[PDB]
Coordinates of C-alpha atoms and ligand atoms in Angstrom, one line a residue:
Chain A
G1 CA 37.0 -21.6 22.7
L2 CA 34.4 -22.4 19.9
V3 CA 32.3 -19.2 20.4
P4 CA 33.2 -15.8 22.3
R5 CA 33.1 -16.7 26.0
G6 CA 29.8 -15.5 27.2
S7 CA 27.9 -15.3 23.7
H8 CA 24.8 -17.6 22.8
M9 CA 26.1 -20.8 21.4
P10 CA 24.1 -22.0 18.5
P11 CA 22.9 -25.5 17.7
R12 CA 25.4 -28.0 17.4
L13 CA 26.5 -29.4 13.9
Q14 CA 29.3 -32.0 14.0
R15 CA 31.7 -32.8 11.0
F16 CA 33.7 -36.0 10.2
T17 CA 35.6 -40.0 7.0
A18 CA 36.2 -42.3 10.0
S19 CA 34.1 -44.9 12.0
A20 CA 30.3 -45.3 11.2
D21 CA 29.5 -46.1 14.7
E22 CA 31.3 -42.7 15.2
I23 CA 29.2 -41.0 12.6
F24 CA 26.0 -42.5 13.6
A25 CA 26.3 -41.3 17.3
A26 CA 26.4 -37.6 16.0
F27 CA 23.5 -38.4 13.9
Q28 CA 21.5 -39.7 16.8
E29 CA 22.7 -37.0 19.2
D30 CA 21.9 -34.1 16.8
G31 CA 19.8 -35.4 13.8
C32 CA 22.3 -34.5 11.3
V33 CA 26.2 -34.5 10.6
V34 CA 28.4 -33.4 7.9
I35 CA 30.7 -35.9 6.2
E36 CA 33.4 -34.0 4.5
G37 CA 34.3 -35.4 1.2
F38 CA 31.6 -38.0 0.8
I39 CA 32.3 -38.4 -2.8
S40 CA 36.0 -38.2 -4.1
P41 CA 37.2 -34.8 -5.9
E42 CA 37.1 -35.8 -9.5
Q43 CA 34.0 -37.9 -8.8
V44 CA 31.9 -35.0 -7.8
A45 CA 33.5 -33.3 -11.1
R46 CA 32.7 -36.1 -13.6
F47 CA 29.3 -36.5 -12.1
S48 CA 28.5 -32.7 -12.5
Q49 CA 29.7 -32.7 -16.1
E50 CA 27.8 -35.7 -16.8
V51 CA 24.5 -34.3 -15.6
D52 CA 25.3 -30.8 -16.9
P53 CA 23.5 -31.4 -20.3
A54 CA 20.4 -32.6 -18.4
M55 CA 20.4 -29.6 -16.2
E56 CA 21.0 -27.4 -19.3
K57 CA 17.6 -28.4 -20.7
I58 CA 15.6 -27.6 -17.4
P59 CA 13.8 -24.4 -17.7
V60 CA 13.6 -21.8 -15.0
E61 CA 10.4 -20.7 -13.4
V62 CA 10.1 -17.0 -12.2
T63 CA 6.8 -17.1 -10.1
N64 CA 7.1 -15.3 -6.8
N65 CA 4.5 -18.3 -6.2
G66 CA 6.1 -19.8 -2.8
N67 CA 6.6 -23.1 -4.5
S68 CA 9.9 -25.0 -4.3
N69 CA 10.2 -24.7 -8.1
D70 CA 10.5 -20.8 -7.9
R71 CA 14.2 -20.5 -9.6
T72 CA 15.3 -24.1 -8.4
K73 CA 16.1 -26.7 -10.9
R74 CA 15.3 -30.2 -10.0
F75 CA 16.3 -33.4 -11.9
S76 CA 16.2 -37.1 -10.9
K77 CA 17.5 -39.4 -13.8
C78 CA 20.9 -39.5 -12.7
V79 CA 21.4 -43.4 -12.9
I80 CA 20.3 -43.0 -16.6
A81 CA 22.4 -39.8 -17.2
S82 CA 25.8 -40.4 -15.3
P83 CA 27.8 -43.5 -15.3
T84 CA 30.0 -42.3 -12.3
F85 CA 27.0 -42.0 -10.2
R86 CA 25.4 -45.5 -11.0
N87 CA 28.9 -47.3 -11.1
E88 CA 30.5 -45.5 -8.0
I89 CA 28.7 -43.0 -5.8
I90 CA 25.8 -45.3 -5.2
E91 CA 28.4 -48.0 -4.2
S92 CA 29.9 -46.2 -1.2
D93 CA 30.5 -48.8 1.5
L94 CA 30.0 -45.7 3.9
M95 CA 26.2 -45.1 2.8
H96 CA 25.2 -48.7 3.4
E97 CA 26.8 -49.2 6.6
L98 CA 25.1 -46.0 7.8
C99 CA 21.8 -47.0 6.3
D100 CA 22.4 -50.2 7.9
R101 CA 22.3 -48.7 11.4
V102 CA 19.4 -46.5 10.9
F103 CA 17.1 -49.2 9.0
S104 CA 18.0 -52.7 9.3
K105 CA 17.2 -55.3 11.8
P106 CA 19.1 -58.1 12.6
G107 CA 18.5 -61.3 10.3
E108 CA 16.0 -59.3 8.0
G109 CA 18.7 -58.1 5.4
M110 CA 18.3 -54.6 4.1
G111 CA 15.6 -52.5 5.7
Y112 CA 16.2 -49.7 3.3
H113 CA 15.9 -48.5 -0.5
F114 CA 16.1 -45.3 -2.4
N115 CA 13.3 -42.8 -2.2
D116 CA 15.1 -40.3 -4.9
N117 CA 18.1 -39.4 -6.8
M118 CA 17.7 -35.7 -7.0
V119 CA 20.1 -32.9 -8.4
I120 CA 18.7 -29.5 -7.1
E121 CA 20.2 -26.4 -8.3
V122 CA 19.3 -23.1 -6.5
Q123 CA 19.1 -20.4 -9.1
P124 CA 20.6 -16.9 -8.3
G125 CA 18.0 -14.8 -6.5
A126 CA 15.7 -17.7 -5.5
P127 CA 13.7 -17.1 -2.6
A128 CA 14.4 -19.1 0.6
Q129 CA 12.6 -22.4 0.8
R130 CA 10.1 -23.0 3.5
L131 CA 11.1 -24.6 6.5
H132 CA 10.2 -28.4 6.6
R133 CA 10.7 -31.9 7.8
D134 CA 11.3 -34.5 4.8
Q135 CA 9.0 -36.8 6.6
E136 CA 6.4 -34.5 5.8
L137 CA 6.5 -36.6 2.6
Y138 CA 4.8 -39.3 4.6
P139 CA 1.9 -37.1 6.1
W140 CA 1.2 -39.3 9.5
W141 CA 5.1 -39.5 10.6
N142 CA 5.0 -36.2 12.5
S143 CA 2.3 -37.4 14.6
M144 CA 4.5 -40.0 16.0
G145 CA 6.8 -37.4 17.4
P146 CA 10.4 -37.8 18.3
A147 CA 9.8 -41.3 19.6
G148 CA 8.7 -42.6 16.2
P149 CA 11.0 -44.8 14.0
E150 CA 13.1 -43.3 11.4
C151 CA 11.4 -43.1 8.0
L152 CA 13.9 -41.2 5.9
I153 CA 17.4 -39.8 5.6
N154 CA 19.0 -37.8 3.1
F155 CA 22.7 -37.9 2.1
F156 CA 22.8 -34.4 0.9
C157 CA 25.7 -33.8 -1.1
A158 CA 27.3 -30.5 -2.4
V159 CA 28.1 -30.1 -6.2
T160 CA 29.0 -26.5 -6.4
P161 CA 30.2 -24.8 -3.2
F162 CA 27.8 -24.2 -0.4
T163 CA 28.0 -20.8 1.0
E164 CA 26.0 -18.4 3.5
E165 CA 25.7 -16.4 0.2
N166 CA 24.6 -18.6 -2.4
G167 CA 21.6 -20.3 -0.5
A168 CA 23.2 -23.4 1.1
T169 CA 20.7 -25.4 3.3
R170 CA 19.9 -24.0 6.7
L171 CA 19.8 -26.9 9.2
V172 CA 18.0 -26.8 12.8
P173 CA 20.1 -29.5 14.7
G174 CA 18.2 -31.0 17.5
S175 CA 14.7 -30.3 16.0
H176 CA 14.4 -34.3 15.9
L177 CA 14.0 -34.1 19.6
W178 CA 11.4 -31.5 19.8
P179 CA 8.3 -32.8 21.9
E180 CA 5.5 -32.0 19.1
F181 CA 6.4 -32.5 15.4
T182 CA 4.5 -29.7 13.7
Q183 CA 4.1 -27.9 10.3
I184 CA 6.3 -24.9 10.4
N185 CA 4.2 -21.9 9.8
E186 CA 2.9 -19.2 12.2
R187 CA -0.5 -21.0 12.4
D188 CA 1.0 -24.3 13.4
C189 CA 4.4 -23.8 14.6
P190 CA 4.5 -21.6 18.0
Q191 CA 8.2 -21.2 17.7
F192 CA 7.8 -19.5 14.3
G193 CA 10.0 -16.7 13.6
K194 CA 12.2 -17.9 16.7
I195 CA 13.7 -20.9 14.8
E196 CA 17.4 -20.7 15.0
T197 CA 18.9 -22.0 11.8
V198 CA 22.5 -23.1 11.0
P199 CA 23.7 -22.7 7.4
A200 CA 25.3 -25.9 6.0
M201 CA 30.4 -27.2 2.6
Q202 CA 32.7 -27.8 -0.4
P203 CA 32.0 -29.8 -3.7
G204 CA 31.9 -33.5 -2.6
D205 CA 31.0 -33.0 1.3
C206 CA 27.8 -34.4 2.3
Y207 CA 25.4 -33.9 5.3
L208 CA 23.6 -37.0 6.7
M209 CA 20.0 -35.6 8.0
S210 CA 17.3 -37.3 9.7
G211 CA 13.8 -36.9 8.3
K212 CA 12.7 -35.3 11.7
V213 CA 15.0 -32.3 11.3
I214 CA 13.7 -29.0 10.5
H215 CA 15.5 -27.3 7.4
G216 CA 15.3 -25.5 4.2
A217 CA 17.3 -23.9 1.3
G218 CA 18.1 -20.5 2.0
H219 CA 17.7 -17.4 -0.4
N220 CA 20.5 -17.3 -3.0
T221 CA 23.9 -13.6 -5.6
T222 CA 24.1 -12.5 -9.2
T223 CA 25.7 -15.5 -11.1
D224 CA 26.0 -18.7 -8.8
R225 CA 23.8 -21.6 -9.6
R226 CA 24.2 -23.7 -6.2
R227 CA 23.9 -27.3 -7.2
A228 CA 23.5 -30.4 -4.9
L229 CA 22.8 -34.3 -5.1
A230 CA 20.2 -35.7 -2.7
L231 CA 20.4 -39.4 -2.0
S232 CA 17.0 -39.9 -0.1
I233 CA 16.8 -43.4 1.2
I234 CA 13.7 -44.9 3.1
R235 CA 12.8 -47.9 4.8
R236 CA 11.5 -50.9 2.9
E237 CA 8.0 -50.5 3.7
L238 CA 7.5 -47.1 2.3
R239 CA 7.0 -46.2 -1.3
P240 CA 9.6 -44.4 -3.5
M241 CA 9.0 -41.0 -5.1
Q242 CA 10.6 -42.2 -8.2
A243 CA 9.5 -45.3 -10.1
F244 CA 13.1 -46.3 -10.7
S245 CA 12.3 -49.8 -11.7
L246 CA 10.1 -48.8 -14.7
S247 CA 12.5 -45.9 -16.0
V248 CA 15.9 -47.4 -15.4
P249 CA 16.5 -49.7 -18.3
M250 CA 17.2 -53.2 -17.8
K251 CA 20.6 -52.8 -19.1
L252 CA 22.1 -50.8 -16.2
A253 CA 20.1 -53.0 -13.4
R254 CA 22.0 -56.0 -14.9
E255 CA 25.3 -54.0 -14.0
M256 CA 24.1 -53.4 -10.7
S257 CA 25.3 -55.2 -7.4
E258 CA 22.8 -57.1 -5.7
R259 CA 22.5 -54.5 -3.2
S260 CA 22.0 -51.8 -5.7
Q261 CA 19.5 -53.9 -7.3
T262 CA 17.6 -53.9 -4.1
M263 CA 18.0 -50.3 -3.6
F264 CA 15.9 -49.5 -6.8
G265 CA 13.6 -52.3 -6.6
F266 CA 14.9 -54.6 -9.3
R267 CA 15.3 -57.0 -6.2
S268 CA 13.2 -57.8 -3.2
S269 CA 14.3 -58.5 0.6
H270 CA 8.7 -59.8 2.3
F271 CA 7.8 -56.5 0.3
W272 CA 8.0 -55.9 -3.5
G273 CA 7.9 -59.6 -4.2
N274 CA 6.6 -61.7 -7.0
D275 CA 3.9 -64.3 -5.7
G276 CA 6.4 -65.6 -3.0
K277 CA 9.6 -65.1 -4.9
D278 CA 12.0 -62.5 -5.5
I279 CA 11.3 -60.3 -8.4
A280 CA 14.9 -60.6 -9.4
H281 CA 13.9 -64.2 -10.7
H282 CA 11.2 -63.0 -13.0
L283 CA 13.5 -60.1 -14.2
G284 CA 16.1 -62.4 -15.2
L285 CA 18.9 -61.8 -12.5
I286 CA 18.9 -65.1 -11.1
Chain B
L1 CA -31.7 -65.2 17.9
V2 CA -30.2 -67.5 20.7
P3 CA -31.8 -68.3 23.8
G4 CA -30.2 -65.2 28.9
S5 CA -27.6 -66.7 26.6
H6 CA -24.6 -64.6 25.9
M7 CA -25.1 -62.7 22.6
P8 CA -21.6 -62.3 20.8
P9 CA -20.4 -59.4 18.8
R10 CA -22.3 -58.0 15.9
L11 CA -20.9 -58.1 12.3
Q12 CA -23.1 -55.8 10.2
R13 CA -24.4 -57.1 6.8
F14 CA -25.3 -54.8 3.8
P15 CA -26.0 -55.8 -0.1
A16 CA -23.9 -54.6 -2.7
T17 CA -26.5 -52.3 -3.6
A18 CA -26.6 -50.3 -0.5
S19 CA -25.2 -46.6 -0.2
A20 CA -21.6 -46.5 0.0
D21 CA -22.4 -44.0 2.8
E22 CA -24.4 -46.7 4.6
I23 CA -21.6 -49.2 4.2
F24 CA -18.8 -47.0 5.4
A25 CA -20.9 -45.9 8.3
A26 CA -20.9 -49.4 9.4
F27 CA -17.1 -49.8 8.5
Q28 CA -16.3 -46.8 10.6
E29 CA -18.3 -48.1 13.7
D30 CA -17.3 -51.5 13.7
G31 CA -14.0 -51.5 11.7
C32 CA -15.3 -54.3 9.4
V33 CA -18.8 -54.8 7.6
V34 CA -20.2 -57.5 5.2
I35 CA -20.9 -56.8 1.6
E36 CA -23.0 -59.5 0.1
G37 CA -22.8 -59.8 -3.7
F38 CA -19.8 -57.9 -3.7
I39 CA -18.9 -60.0 -6.6
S40 CA -21.7 -61.9 -8.6
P41 CA -22.1 -65.5 -8.5
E42 CA -21.5 -65.9 -12.0
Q43 CA -18.3 -63.7 -11.7
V44 CA -16.9 -65.5 -8.6
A45 CA -17.4 -68.9 -10.4
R46 CA -15.7 -67.8 -13.4
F47 CA -12.7 -66.3 -11.3
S48 CA -12.5 -69.6 -9.3
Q49 CA -12.5 -71.4 -12.4
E50 CA -9.7 -69.4 -14.2
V51 CA -7.4 -69.4 -11.0
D52 CA -7.9 -73.2 -10.5
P53 CA -5.2 -74.5 -12.6
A54 CA -2.6 -72.6 -10.6
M55 CA -4.2 -73.5 -7.5
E56 CA -3.8 -77.0 -8.2
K57 CA -0.2 -76.8 -9.2
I58 CA 0.5 -75.3 -5.5
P59 CA 1.6 -78.0 -3.1
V60 CA 0.0 -77.9 0.3
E61 CA 2.8 -77.7 2.8
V62 CA 2.3 -79.7 5.9
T63 CA 4.8 -79.0 8.7
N64 CA 5.8 -80.5 12.3
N65 CA 4.8 -77.0 13.7
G66 CA 1.3 -76.0 14.4
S67 CA 3.6 -71.7 11.1
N68 CA 0.4 -70.6 9.1
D69 CA 0.6 -73.9 7.2
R70 CA -1.8 -76.0 5.0
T71 CA -3.0 -72.7 3.3
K72 CA -2.5 -72.1 -0.5
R73 CA -1.6 -68.5 -1.4
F74 CA -1.6 -67.4 -5.0
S75 CA -1.2 -63.6 -6.1
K76 CA -0.9 -63.5 -9.9
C77 CA -4.8 -63.1 -10.2
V78 CA -4.4 -60.3 -13.1
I79 CA -2.4 -62.7 -15.3
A80 CA -4.4 -65.7 -14.6
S81 CA -8.0 -64.4 -14.7
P82 CA -9.8 -62.1 -17.0
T83 CA -12.8 -61.9 -14.9
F84 CA -10.6 -60.5 -12.0
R85 CA -8.8 -58.0 -14.3
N86 CA -11.7 -56.9 -16.4
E87 CA -14.7 -57.0 -14.0
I88 CA -13.4 -57.5 -10.5
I89 CA -11.1 -54.9 -9.7
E90 CA -13.3 -52.6 -11.7
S91 CA -15.8 -52.3 -8.9
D92 CA -17.3 -49.1 -8.4
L93 CA -18.5 -49.8 -5.0
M94 CA -14.9 -50.9 -4.1
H95 CA -13.3 -47.7 -5.2
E96 CA -16.4 -45.5 -3.8
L97 CA -15.2 -47.1 -0.4
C98 CA -11.6 -46.6 -0.7
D99 CA -11.9 -42.9 -1.7
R100 CA -14.0 -42.4 1.5
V101 CA -10.9 -43.8 3.4
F102 CA -7.9 -43.1 1.5
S103 CA -8.4 -39.9 -1.0
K104 CA -7.7 -36.6 0.2
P105 CA -9.2 -33.4 -1.6
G106 CA -7.4 -32.3 -4.6
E107 CA -4.8 -35.3 -4.7
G108 CA -6.6 -37.9 -6.8
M109 CA -6.4 -41.5 -5.7
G110 CA -4.8 -41.7 -2.3
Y111 CA -4.7 -45.8 -2.4
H112 CA -3.2 -48.7 -4.5
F113 CA -2.9 -52.5 -4.6
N114 CA -0.8 -54.1 -1.8
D115 CA -1.9 -57.5 -3.0
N116 CA -4.4 -59.9 -4.9
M117 CA -4.2 -62.9 -2.9
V118 CA -6.3 -66.2 -3.3
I119 CA -6.1 -67.8 0.1
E120 CA -7.3 -71.2 0.1
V121 CA -7.4 -73.0 3.6
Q122 CA -6.9 -76.6 3.6
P123 CA -8.9 -79.2 5.5
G124 CA -7.4 -79.6 9.0
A125 CA -5.5 -76.3 8.7
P126 CA -5.0 -74.9 12.0
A127 CA -6.0 -71.5 13.0
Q128 CA -4.0 -68.3 12.4
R129 CA -2.6 -66.2 15.4
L130 CA -4.8 -63.2 16.1
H131 CA -3.2 -60.2 14.4
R132 CA -4.0 -56.6 12.8
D133 CA -3.1 -56.3 9.1
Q134 CA -1.5 -53.1 9.7
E135 CA 1.3 -54.9 11.8
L136 CA 2.8 -55.4 8.2
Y137 CA 3.8 -51.6 8.6
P138 CA 5.3 -51.9 12.0
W139 CA 5.2 -48.5 13.4
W140 CA 1.5 -48.1 12.7
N141 CA 0.2 -49.6 16.1
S142 CA 2.2 -46.9 18.1
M143 CA -0.1 -44.2 16.7
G144 CA -3.2 -46.0 18.3
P145 CA -6.8 -45.7 17.1
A146 CA -6.3 -41.9 16.3
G147 CA -3.7 -43.0 13.8
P148 CA -4.7 -42.7 10.0
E149 CA -5.7 -45.8 8.1
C150 CA -3.0 -47.3 6.3
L151 CA -4.7 -50.6 4.8
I152 CA -8.1 -52.0 4.2
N153 CA -8.7 -55.5 2.7
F154 CA -11.9 -56.5 0.6
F155 CA -11.7 -60.1 1.8
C156 CA -14.3 -62.1 -0.5
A157 CA -15.6 -65.6 -0.2
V158 CA -14.9 -67.5 -3.3
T159 CA -16.4 -70.7 -1.8
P160 CA -18.7 -70.7 1.2
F161 CA -17.4 -69.5 4.7
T162 CA -18.6 -71.4 7.6
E163 CA -17.6 -71.7 11.0
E164 CA -16.3 -75.5 10.4
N165 CA -14.2 -74.6 7.3
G166 CA -12.2 -71.7 9.1
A167 CA -13.8 -68.5 8.0
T168 CA -11.9 -65.5 9.4
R169 CA -12.3 -64.9 12.9
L170 CA -12.9 -60.9 13.6
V171 CA -13.0 -58.6 16.7
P172 CA -15.4 -55.7 15.7
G173 CA -14.4 -52.6 17.5
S174 CA -10.8 -53.4 18.1
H175 CA -10.0 -50.8 15.7
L176 CA -11.0 -48.5 18.9
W177 CA -8.9 -50.1 21.6
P178 CA -6.7 -47.4 23.4
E179 CA -3.7 -49.3 23.0
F180 CA -2.7 -51.5 19.8
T181 CA -0.1 -54.1 20.9
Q182 CA 0.7 -57.3 19.2
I183 CA -1.4 -60.1 20.5
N184 CA 0.8 -62.2 22.6
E185 CA 1.0 -62.9 26.2
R186 CA 4.1 -60.7 26.8
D187 CA 2.1 -57.5 25.4
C188 CA -1.4 -58.2 25.1
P189 CA -3.3 -58.0 28.6
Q190 CA -6.5 -59.4 27.0
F191 CA -4.5 -62.4 25.5
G192 CA -6.7 -65.5 25.6
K193 CA -9.9 -63.4 26.7
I194 CA -10.6 -62.0 23.3
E195 CA -14.0 -62.8 21.6
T196 CA -14.2 -63.1 18.1
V197 CA -17.0 -63.7 15.4
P198 CA -16.7 -65.5 12.3
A199 CA -17.3 -63.9 8.7
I200 CA -20.0 -66.4 7.6
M201 CA -20.4 -65.7 3.7
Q202 CA -21.6 -67.2 0.6
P203 CA -19.5 -67.1 -2.7
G204 CA -19.0 -63.4 -3.9
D205 CA -19.8 -61.8 -0.3
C206 CA -16.9 -60.1 1.1
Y207 CA -16.2 -58.3 4.3
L208 CA -14.2 -55.0 4.2
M209 CA -12.0 -54.7 7.1
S210 CA -9.5 -51.9 8.6
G211 CA -5.9 -52.9 9.3
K212 CA -6.6 -51.7 12.9
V213 CA -9.0 -54.9 13.2
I214 CA -7.8 -58.0 15.3
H215 CA -8.7 -61.0 13.2
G216 CA -7.4 -64.4 12.3
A217 CA -8.3 -67.3 9.9
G218 CA -10.1 -69.8 11.8
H219 CA -9.4 -73.8 12.2
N220 CA -10.5 -75.8 9.3
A221 CA -12.0 -78.6 11.0
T222 CA -13.6 -80.4 8.0
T223 CA -12.1 -83.2 5.9
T224 CA -13.5 -82.1 2.5
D225 CA -13.5 -78.3 2.5
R226 CA -10.9 -76.2 0.7
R227 CA -12.0 -73.0 1.8
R228 CA -11.1 -70.4 -1.1
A229 CA -10.8 -66.6 -0.6
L230 CA -9.9 -63.6 -2.5
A231 CA -8.1 -60.9 -0.7
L232 CA -8.0 -57.3 -2.1
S233 CA -5.4 -55.7 0.1
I234 CA -5.4 -51.8 -0.5
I235 CA -3.0 -49.3 1.1
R236 CA -2.0 -45.7 1.1
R237 CA -0.3 -44.3 -2.2
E238 CA 2.7 -43.8 0.3
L239 CA 3.2 -47.3 1.3
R240 CA 5.2 -50.0 -0.4
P241 CA 3.0 -53.0 -1.9
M242 CA 4.0 -56.6 -1.1
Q243 CA 3.8 -57.4 -4.7
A244 CA 5.9 -55.7 -7.4
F245 CA 2.8 -55.8 -10.0
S246 CA 4.3 -53.4 -12.4
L247 CA 7.4 -55.7 -12.9
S248 CA 5.7 -59.0 -13.2
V249 CA 2.1 -57.9 -14.7
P250 CA 2.8 -57.9 -18.6
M251 CA 2.5 -54.6 -20.3
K252 CA 0.2 -55.9 -22.9
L253 CA -2.2 -56.4 -19.8
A254 CA -1.3 -52.8 -18.5
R255 CA -2.6 -51.2 -22.0
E256 CA -6.0 -53.0 -21.6
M257 CA -6.7 -51.4 -18.0
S258 CA -8.6 -48.6 -17.1
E259 CA -6.5 -45.6 -15.9
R260 CA -7.7 -46.0 -12.3
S261 CA -6.8 -49.7 -12.8
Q262 CA -3.1 -48.7 -13.9
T263 CA -2.9 -46.3 -11.0
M264 CA -3.6 -49.4 -8.6
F265 CA -1.0 -51.5 -9.9
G266 CA 1.7 -48.7 -10.5
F267 CA 1.5 -48.2 -14.1
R268 CA 0.6 -44.6 -13.5
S269 CA 1.4 -42.1 -10.8
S270 CA -0.8 -40.1 -8.5
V271 CA -0.2 -36.4 -7.5
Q272 CA 0.6 -35.7 -3.8
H273 CA 0.3 -32.2 -2.4
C274 CA 2.1 -30.9 0.8
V275 CA 2.2 -25.5 -1.0
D276 CA 4.3 -28.1 -3.4
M277 CA 2.8 -30.9 -5.7
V278 CA 4.7 -34.1 -6.1
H279 CA 4.2 -37.2 -8.3
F280 CA 4.4 -40.3 -6.3
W281 CA 5.9 -43.3 -8.0
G282 CA 6.8 -40.8 -11.0
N283 CA 9.5 -40.3 -13.5
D284 CA 11.5 -37.0 -13.1
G285 CA 8.6 -34.7 -12.9
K286 CA 6.2 -36.6 -15.2
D287 CA 3.5 -39.4 -14.7
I288 CA 5.4 -42.6 -15.1
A289 CA 2.5 -43.6 -17.6
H290 CA 4.3 -41.3 -20.3
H291 CA 7.5 -43.4 -20.5
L292 CA 5.5 -46.6 -20.3
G293 CA 3.2 -45.3 -23.2
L294 CA 0.0 -45.4 -21.7
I295 CA -1.2 -41.7 -22.2
Ligands
8TC1 C1 6.9 -31.8 -3.4 C2 8.1 -32.1 -2.6 C3 8.1 -32.7 -1.2 C4 6.6 -33.1 -0.9 C5 9.0 -33.8 -1.3 C6 10.5 -33.4 -1.8 C7 11.7 -34.5 -1.3 C8 11.2 -36.0 -2.1 C9 11.4 -35.0 0.3 C10 12.8 -35.6 0.5 C11 14.0 -35.2 0.0 O1 15.0 -36.2 0.6 C12 14.1 -34.9 -1.3 C13 15.4 -33.9 -1.3 C14 14.6 -36.0 -2.2 C15 12.9 -34.0 -1.8 C16 13.0 -33.6 -3.2 C17 11.7 -32.6 -3.7 C18 10.5 -32.9 -3.4 C19 9.8 -33.8 -4.4 C20 9.5 -31.7 -3.1 C21 9.4 -30.8 -4.4 O2 10.2 -30.9 -5.5 O3 8.6 -29.6 -4.6 C22 7.9 -29.1 -5.6 C23 9.9 -30.6 -2.1 O4 10.8 -29.7 -2.4 C24 9.4 -30.5 -0.7 C25 10.5 -30.1 0.4 O5 8.6 -29.2 -0.6 C26 8.6 -31.6 -0.3 O6 8.4 -32.0 1.0
AKG2 O1 18.0 -27.5 -1.8 C1 18.4 -27.6 -0.7 O2 19.3 -27.2 -0.3 C2 17.4 -28.3 0.4 C3 16.8 -29.5 -0.5 C4 15.4 -29.8 0.1 O3 15.2 -29.7 1.2 C5 14.0 -30.4 -0.7 O4 13.8 -29.8 -1.9 O5 13.3 -31.1 0.1
AKG3 O1 -7.5 -66.5 5.5 C1 -8.1 -65.6 6.5 O2 -9.3 -66.0 6.7 C2 -7.3 -64.8 7.2 C3 -6.3 -64.4 6.3 C4 -5.5 -63.2 6.9 O3 -6.2 -62.6 7.9 C5 -4.1 -62.8 6.6 O4 -3.5 -63.6 5.9 O5 -3.4 -61.7 7.0
FE4 FE1 14.0 -31.1 2.6
FE5 FE1 -4.8 -60.7 8.1

């Protein structure tokens, strides 16, 4: 009794803070999954307050250009600006145990690190964002199709509420299993215009989406800044969009755990080394 | 010429004053090509001299496993060698060829440094397993020869490369086989049947090789010869380097670099286009070179 008997049933999008082997199976089966309450209530709140001054000084472009910057604010310096982010959120033992199932291989330590820490605020009346796979960031990955390894996953977390009206993210569950991975336009995608989305949540819930999954922010209302926190995580062989080890000051890196140092590139795992030695030695982190 | 003798595979040779289109054509055909005088004999001799203290402090590891042992590997070339940072990495032919491999229209430099490794193969050192350098990026073989390029190496003779002292063994045209497997008995059907050719070179010569080319260091069967190489390993901007150069190379040395050299070492970003434009290795919407103060 999930849809009225006889109706078309829409692509499946499971919801779940229980077993990691559990959430991981929903990820594998569908390409994405929701984690209701991924960051605590006040945590999501103290976080949003802490980055709000930074958001306040980001001007809004009104361009009708088609870009992803048309009335959408984006801001990446979350570690610099938010103590609760760098002290609490990125230390979710849930994140890591999930990242460990997507990415790490046995006896090789952490096969993952951060790509980005982005706060995305869809301004009211913002055109719906182009449909895309995140792994289009790494242009050849689509050419490996659904059988290729995972390159990227997003812990996409709501900051203000996510509604059909304010432009929450439209997901396409199961698009990680399509036979050919393509750009999503009328020229390159045959299914263009027939692609059945599902809008994605309340402040603190996150959805865990594969980089193979087609998606996009929808159209935005008259006075609702729809604000989100994207934890982009990639495998250790890939380069981050943000140069976090050169902008996050050494002070904050000294306060991080070994594993979070590895996420921001203040520590190696043999990639990102220093002539046969961990880069951590040279940085005065023993 | 040899005498109905079997003629082994051809490794094409060009002087460093040839058309970058002529050299790249060879690279595209065979997957590897020798560039003679890539570095001048005076430049390489100063380089060898400037890194030689660091090389002598490096213990030769001998092991009871015949392991990629008895090979010295040193990567702090920028810190240790003015010739390297002031002249060698400013090779225009090197950047001409990288652009033809990596750089898309309208996205600036599509490449950067993976590594800068002095590789000195010691007397008696055993040969290296046959491998492709793109095995570093483990999904890459699965795209086969149609896959884009992830990596190229400018592998320079610092001291002479001879068949006896362990000059690299290469397989021209292995970037074109229909299936890219690891080269072992389990997965490779040609295992044991693969014909290689050595990179015979004088100091300052180099070969340029695709990550798709099967190759391995040869056995050093001499008693005197420490066979010294300089490997300039260059990858796509989207891939992680093996060296964290921006974190170990001093900022004092960063400020002295040309802007394309800063990009190579991650002191400066490059802009990638997907409708959307994105700084790769950037700082919250701006080139990382602002926060660092490099203009
Ligand atoms: C240029 C962009 C790129 C190429 C990559 C992404 C990307 C790093 C992709 C992976 C994600 O986990 C996440 C949320 C961290 C985004 C953040 C925004 C940008 C940087 C981007 C953007 O800001 O557009 C002006 C885009 O929105 C987009 C969709 O179009 C892109 O595909
Ligand atoms: O803002 C959103 O809801 C989607 C974010 C996204 O997909 C992107 O910017 O790449
Ligand atoms: O030293 C050589 O000639 C081969 C080096 C090589 O192929 C490698 O280290 O990947
Ligand atoms: Fe996206
Ligand atoms: Fe190699």
